[PDB]
């Protein structure tokens, strides 16, 4: 179940797109691997950077506690 | 950086004829533009040794063209360096 | 940046001098100087009470403005930066649009031609002065009053500064130049920035003569004296201390604390100095 296939068009540089960016994060808060997002090398780099900016603004989290 | 306008102004001033873009004159002029902006950059950024390698490479490039233009046309050579404040 | 000398005399080998680069004017304001009455270290009884003082260069005292809440809202132009022989900081001459002229101690980064102002509304810029409670936490600051309207007492020497650390009630928490953490009342004025001439501590005096120009007479070790003179006096040949190292007056001088214990300001001191 790859995340990119679950979404139409989105801008990989929109650091404020909280509701799209948040899907690329594991339930524990981490940036998901390319195997689980379905992005190529080139676009995974843009995603990772954008997530990081959004983290600094407080939109996305840096870490979440794992609930069993 | 160096704007697109600034570069064209330099090319116009040294082009040997209307559309000229890669003459030895135009080349020494463009390199001189970069050399002088990197030198000013390195004066403030004295620990930027990696960009300093770019400077040596530029200076060596300009040097080879100048030796070529000196061998082919001494008059054109002297006027180019005087027109640019070079050879000290 | 301190200046060095070639070793063309034995003393010039190590001597270093301030470069005096910030100094833009070489004479004081006539109306802001008065004679500095040399003491030799002697009190009103004529008795030496601080040993080894005297014989330094003649100096004129420059009147420094250690209040500044004096002239809230009136901006002034930084007209000059000058030498002051009575302190390690340099001093800056201010021309108020008032027409009044005063001296402040020159902060690090001050520029002649810039303006400065004092007050609750002053911008947080080098050379401006505000009550502590209006300076943002984290700002490095100098010429701090200790109690409101009593005059700047802290962070006045060359290169020094205090850092605002937090707020509690009417009071602000400062990290003084000594590293001590101290509550200071929020209505106390401070000036933003650090004191200038930060290279002062790198001066190498170089020769005995240079201390003498500063009014520092030779200091003679207790161990060089006789028992009439000093605890360390006496002994045949050299002698170790033979007792806890003491002052001429007998009190121990290696670690013995001397701040008074029941002092009221202890309630306002959070952490004793470090290092």
């Amino acid at each position: 179940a790859k995340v990119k296939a679950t979404l139409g068009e989105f801008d990989l540089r929109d650091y404020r797109n909280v509701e799209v960016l948040k899907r690329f994060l594991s339930e524990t808060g981490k940036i998901l691997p390319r195997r689980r997002t379905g992005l190529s090398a080139k676009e995974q780099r843009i995603l990772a950077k954008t997530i990081k900016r959004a983290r600094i603004l407080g939109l996305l989290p840096f870490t979440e506690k794992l609930v069993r | 950086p160096i704007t697109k306008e600034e570069k064209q102004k330099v090319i116009q001033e040294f082009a040997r004829f209307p559309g000229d873009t890669g003459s030895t004159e135009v080349q020494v002029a463009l390199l001189t533009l970069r050399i002088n902006r990197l030198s000013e950059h390195l004066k403030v950024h004295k620990k930027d040794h990696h960009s300093h390698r770019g400077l040596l490479m530029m200076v060596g490039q300009r040097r080879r063209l100048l030796r070529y233009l000196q061998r082919e046309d001494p008059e054109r050579y002297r006027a180019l360096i005087e027109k640019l404040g070079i050879r000290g | 940046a301190v200046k060095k000398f070639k070793p063309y005399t034995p003393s010039r080998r190590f001597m270093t001098v301030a470069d005096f680069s910030e100094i833009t004017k070489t004479e004081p304001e006539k109306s802001l100087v008065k004679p500095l009455k040399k003491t030799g270290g002697r009190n009103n009884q004529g008795r030496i009470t601080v040993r080894f003082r005297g014989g330094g260069h003649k100096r004129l005292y420059r009147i420094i403005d250690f209040k500044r809440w004096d002239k809230v809202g009136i901006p002034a132009k930084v007209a000059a930066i000058e030498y002051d022989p009575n302190r390690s900081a340099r001093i800056a001459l201010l021309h108020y649009v008032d027409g009044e002229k005063r001296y402040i101690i020159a902060p690090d980064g001050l520029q002649v031609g810039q303006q400065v102002v004092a007050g609750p509304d002053a911008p947080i810029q080098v050379g401006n002065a505000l009550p502590l409670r209006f300076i943002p936490v984290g700002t490095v600051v100098h010429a701090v009053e200790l109690e409101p309207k009593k005059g700047a007492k802290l962070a006045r020497a060359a290169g020094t500064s205090a850092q605002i650390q937090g707020r509690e009630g009417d009071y602000v928490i400062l990290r003084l130049p000594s590293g001590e953490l101290r509550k200071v009342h929020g209505e106390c004025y401070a000036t933003v920035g650090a004191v200038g001439n930060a290279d002062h501590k790198n001066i190498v005096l170089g020769k005995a003569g240079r201390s003498r120009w500063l009014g520092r007479r030779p200091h003679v070790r207790g161990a060089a004296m006789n028992p009439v003179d000093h605890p360390h006096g006496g002994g045949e040949g050299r002698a170790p201390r033979g007792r806890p190292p003491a002052s001429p007056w007998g009190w121990q001088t290696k670690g013995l604390k001397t701040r008074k214990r029941r002092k009221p300001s202890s309630r306002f001191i959070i952490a004793r100095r470090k290092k």
Partner: protein, 100 residues
């Protein structure tokens, strides 16, 4: 000049008077630093992923501006002096990069 985006997070517990004053400080600074506002989105209060300045929400501003290259760092410094500005982030505006 170059086009940038000025993200700004403010103390969410102000009143609209204090808030309008902060926006006033910000609007002058932009102007004062040669920044010409082009667009502006104001999403206001918004729950944060983690507490900023110990509060779980923050008041969000956003301006596309055109301003000269050499003054952006200084502008972001001035935008940060106010105790109520919790965050500033001046990103070089870039074209979208799309997937799908």
């Amino acid at each position: 000049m170059r086009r940038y985006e000025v993200n700004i997070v403010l103390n969410p517990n102000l009143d609209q008077s204090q808030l309008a004053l902060e926006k006033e400080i910000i609007q002058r600074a932009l102007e004062n630093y040669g920044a010409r506002v082009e667009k502006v989105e104001e999403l206001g209060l918004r729950r944060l992923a983690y507490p900023i300045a110990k509060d779980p929400q923050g008041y969000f501003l956003w301006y596309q501006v055109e301003m000269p290259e050499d003054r952006v760092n200084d502008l972001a410094r001035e935008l940060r002096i106010r105790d109520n500005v919790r965050r500033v982030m001046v990103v070089k505006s870039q074209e979208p990069f799309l997937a799908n």
